[PDB]
Amino acid sequence: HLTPEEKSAVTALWGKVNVDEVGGEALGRLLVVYPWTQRFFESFGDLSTPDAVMGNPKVKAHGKKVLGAFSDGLAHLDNLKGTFATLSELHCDKLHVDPENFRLLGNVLVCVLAHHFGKEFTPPVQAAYQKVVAGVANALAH
Amino acid sequence: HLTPEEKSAVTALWGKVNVDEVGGEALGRLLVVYPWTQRFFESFGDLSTPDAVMGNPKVKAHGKKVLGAFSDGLAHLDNLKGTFATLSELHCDKLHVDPENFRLLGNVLVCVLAHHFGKEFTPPVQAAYQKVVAGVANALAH
Amino acid sequence: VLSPADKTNVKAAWGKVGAHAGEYGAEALERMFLSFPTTKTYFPHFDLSHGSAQVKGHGKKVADALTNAVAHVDDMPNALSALSDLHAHKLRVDPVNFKLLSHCLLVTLAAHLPAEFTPAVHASLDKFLASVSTVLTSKYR
Amino acid sequence: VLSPADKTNVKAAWGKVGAHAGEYGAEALERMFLSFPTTKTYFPHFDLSHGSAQVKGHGKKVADALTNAVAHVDDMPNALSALSDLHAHKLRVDPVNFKLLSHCLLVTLAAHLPAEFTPAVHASLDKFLASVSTVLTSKYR
Numbered sequence A, B: 001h002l003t004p005e006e007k008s009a010v011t012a013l014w015g016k017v018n019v020d021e022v023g024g025e026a027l028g029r030l031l032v033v034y035p036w037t038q039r040f041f042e043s044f045g046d047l048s049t050p051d052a053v054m055g056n057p058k059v060k061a062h063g064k065k066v067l068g069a070f071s072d073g074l075a076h077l078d079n080l081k082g083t084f085a086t087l088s089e090l091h092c093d094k095l096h097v098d099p100e101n102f103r104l105l106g107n108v109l110v111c112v113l114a115h116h117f118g119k120e121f122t123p124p125v126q127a128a129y130q131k132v133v134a135g136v137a138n139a140l141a142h
Numbered sequence C, D: 001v002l003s004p005a006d007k008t009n010v011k012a013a014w015g016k017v018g019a020h021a022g023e024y025g026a027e028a029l030e031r032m033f034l035s036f037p038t039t040k041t042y043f044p045h046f047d048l049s050h051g052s053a054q055v056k057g058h059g060k061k062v063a064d065a066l067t068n069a070v071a072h073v074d075d076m077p078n079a080l081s082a083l084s085d086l087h088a089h090k091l092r093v094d095p096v097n098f099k100l101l102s103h104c105l106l107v108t109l110a111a112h113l114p115a116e117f118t119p120a121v122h123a124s125l126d127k128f129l130a131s132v133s134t135v136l137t138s139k140y141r
């Protein structure tokens, strides 16, 4: 559950996110900082350096899709379990991602937004985004 | 979800558990092996040695209550969320136990049953108990 | 284990924190009390409110300890031996809470030092903060 | 950090495992494949069935490595340097899975060695297995 003021502060900041960049930045950071995550993305080519990972065209294009799903989550913030139902099955049945990795990606996203927005990512906006990213991760766990 | 064969194997072994001892053994082992858990039990007196912890009369009496709740869970194994509803609030509102500690206690219980039953705690009976103890821990998390 | 390159990344980024370290420590504590409100039960006699002086002074203690741990990155279990005693024996702080404060420090550094906070530096800072959290919990009974 | 008493507990209990160590290793793998079936995706070309000879021989490799790590408990990062390379660089095994195998080893030892598996020994074995899991993951990129 989020307060009206939280829902508003969340929405106002997301409107200012670059949807072409922020998701690949977040996914590139997960493969650099938590390198066992690269086991799931071995078809994306070379991931053998921070700079290889952050310039991979396949990492950029997949981060777009993940940021899109986070966006779909923010539009449906009172019904996350039903929003992410199909995707939950996709990360469990086909290829099992441990549910602790969803928590790691959401914290990486919070760092990428802090990095972008600076002194506008205030301790209260972070507290609202943490509620959102925990929401998404629990919704995605099977 | 557990198979009929799992439900039966679980029930047959629990019938042979000493309800006066196994719960204090499990709770005593959590305070020895994961000592930050002692922060929640500072009214139970002295906990400053494995032998102090395992002879504390207050640890034995509280392990009886926890084993009783696990027993209530096994009787209602298809409705754990509603069985443990009141207790979930009790471990969150009054005194916040992180939900990862519930996972640690359930694994300690699996070790105590293995220790007691020997070559009767076969790899399949353990797999059924692991499903039960994960059930209880997710039911208890707020 | 910290690489010589991790040690260089950590030393260079924490060098830029400099004389803003007490301020960064207190913002990290404020972020953690706000986002993860269960963490407030370890500080029952503290005024934990915006602009609080008890949190400003604790933020400064935390950041001095990290400045010390960067200076002694090779012998941290020795340099942090008395903190390890306090957190594991006297305070019985649950290890999950060290991950929460580590996150809040990285968020603070990302918001203040955007040009220093590259993916390589992010990975080195995460390793350093996990290694500090390791020593501070490595004790207990 | 392992106490001299942890080192004594670990050395004495693993001493009693003795010539039953390959057998205990294979029971630990069987328990993990049964209870935690996601762990089976690291072994896609193994016959992972009851009484399997591929699992009997792997159980023996795992237990030899622990016998080595008990013998070199002071210099485990050195003794386990090539295992750390294989698990973190080549296999990219997620750290959660090391906790699962550690649990299955402790359950095996509790079921086989009930008089040795006291609360003090339980605590020392948990510390030792977490320290082995630390070295085997301490690498990665």
Ligand code: HEM
Binding pocket: A037, A040, A041, A043, A065, A066, A067, A069, A070, A087, A090, A091, A095, A097, A101, A102, A103, A105, A106, A136, A137, A140
């Ligand atoms: C927690 C937030 C995450 C979200 C919102 C998310 C979202 C998505 C979406 C939208 C897709 C594409 C679905 C499709 O077009 O069929 C996808 C695919 C995938 N995700 Fe995630 N994901 C998340 C976390 C993770 C994590 C933590 C991992 C593993 C470390 C992971 C691994 C994958 C993989 C392997 C695919 C398939 C890639 C391919 O072969 O094309 N995801 N995810």
Ligand code: HEM
Binding pocket: B037, B040, B041, B043, B065, B066, B067, B069, B070, B087, B090, B091, B095, B097, B101, B102, B103, B105, B106, B136, B137, B140
């Ligand atoms: C996961 C299974 C667990 C179960 C089934 C369980 C069950 C119970 C039950 C039945 C009570 C007594 C309720 C009453 O009579 O009012 C209780 C109380 C309590 N539990 Fe748990 N519990 C569990 C785990 C934990 C864990 C992991 C912790 C902390 C490490 C914990 C800390 C407490 C404390 C502090 C009390 C109150 C003790 C007192 O002051 O008397 N419990 N629990």
Ligand code: HEM
Binding pocket: C039, C042, C043, C061, C062, C063, C065, C066, C083, C087, C091, C093, C097, C098, C101, C132, C133, C136
């Ligand atoms: C990088 C991690 C951390 C560092 C470097 C750190 C450092 C310190 C320092 C330097 C002190 C005060 C020592 C003194 O003045 O004698 C302290 C005290 C304390 N810390 Fe931490 N700490 C960390 C994590 C945590 C966490 C995660 C918690 C709990 C959520 C916590 C709770 C406390 C408490 C309750 C005190 C005592 C406060 C007082 O009354 O003065 N610490 N810590």
Ligand code: HEM
Binding pocket: D039, D042, D043, D061, D062, D063, D065, D066, D083, D087, D091, D093, D097, D098, D101, D132, D133, D136
């Ligand atoms: C105490 C923990 C562990 C120890 C001591 C250990 C030890 C070993 C050893 C000695 C080898 C074989 C080395 C060789 O023959 O060259 C090995 C290989 C392997 N291990 Fe582990 N391991 C541990 C945990 C794990 C875990 C948690 C997983 C995954 C769930 C895992 C998956 C593998 C795989 C996939 C291989 C390669 C298998 C093959 O094709 O031969 N290990 N491990």
